[PDB]
Design an enzyme around this catalytic site. Structure first.
Site, short mmCIF file in Angstrom:
data_model
loop_
_atom_site.label_atom_id
_atom_site.label_comp_id
_atom_site.label_asym_id
_atom_site.label_seq_id
_atom_site.Cartn_x
_atom_site.Cartn_y
_atom_site.Cartn_z
N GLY A 93 0.76 -1.25 0.00
CA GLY A 93 0.00 0.00 0.00
C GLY A 93 0.78 1.29 0.00
N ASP A 94 2.09 1.17 0.24
CA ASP A 94 3.04 2.24 -0.07
C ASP A 94 4.34 1.63 -0.64
OD1 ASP A 94 4.49 5.02 1.71
OD2 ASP A 94 4.28 4.70 -0.38
#
Length: 270
Positions: free
Chosen positions: A186-187
């Site tokens: 997610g990042d």
């Protein structure tokens, strides 16, 4: 602050004889440190506010990731609450995908990145306890806007000068029809992936605070937005093709430029 100063001083007494290196500062002493002393190395994160709800969740994510076989460093401790918390882990050896790599290794980093993406996305998301899908992330984007926690002064060229409220209009307007779910970091930026300087094996993933199920394009978008660069990070068009050839092995789809656009836009909110 104070809670913060407490947390850092209690941390410092628990790791005596360890030298503190600032790797990113902010708030009081509120970021990221490398602690080192014969010859163990820890990473220490302390967070300003709900950045701190983030860190408690990261401990849980990190532990689950280790059990399911993704390379992540081991957790030593984490704690606090809303406002201030922290997380200590064994340091991950090697060099981040972020660093300027020897030119003859750049394609290999690209490929290792894809391989790590593939291993994360091979997990069965129904085993994953953490949810980072559009039911979670879109409301977080609305709350950030309404909080004025969206950094409007550093959006991507296509939106310089947009208001938070116009950003959120664009997000709601373009949201995808479907989520092709996988377990996402997610990042997933080269910053959060470290690798062995000799083999380019991935040695650890860091900053897993957003791990959860989401469209695999949530990972593809950010890695490809970074891999497009040729300086800081030191990748470029050929590395992105190499990442995409390797990821495709892999997964027979179907990479959608509209989903990438959407997940690049989502990320502006965080």
């Amino acid at each position: 602050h104070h809670h913060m100063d407490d947390a850092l001083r209690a941390l410092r007494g628990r790791y005596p004889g360890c030298e503190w290196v600032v790797v990113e500062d902010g708030a009081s002493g509120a970021g990221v440190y490398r602690l080192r002393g014969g010859g163990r190395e820890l990473f220490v994160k302390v967070a300003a506010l709900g950045a701190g709800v983030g860190l408690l969740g990261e401990a849980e994510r990190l532990v689950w990731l280790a059990e399911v076989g993704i390379p992540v460093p081991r957790v030593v401790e984490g704690g606090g609450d809303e406002r201030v918390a922290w997380l200590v882990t064994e340091a991950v050896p090697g060099r981040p995908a972020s660093a300027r790599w020897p030119r003859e290794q750049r394609l290999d980093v690209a490929v290792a990145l894809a391989g790590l993406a593939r291993s994360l996305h091979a997990l069965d998301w129904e085993r994953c306890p953490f949810d980072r899908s559009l039911a979670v992330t879109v409301p977080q984007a609305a709350r950030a806007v309404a909080e004025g926690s969206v950094d409007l002064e550093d959006l991507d060229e296509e939106r310089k000068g947009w208001s938070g409220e116009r950003l959120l209009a664009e997000l709601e307007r373009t949201r995808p029809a479907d989520e092709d779910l996988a377990v996402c970091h997610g990042d997933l930026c080269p910053d959060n992936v470290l690798l062995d300087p000799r083999t380019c094996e991935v040695t650890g993933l860091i900053d897993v605070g957003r791990v959860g199920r989401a469209d695999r394009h949530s990972d593809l978008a950010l890695v490809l937005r970074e891999l497009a660069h040729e300086e800081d990070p030191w990748f470029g068009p050929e590395c992105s093709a190499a990442f995409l050839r390797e990821y495709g092995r892999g997964w027979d789809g179907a990479v959608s430029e509209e989903k990438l656009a959407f997940y690049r836009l989502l990320d502006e909110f965080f």
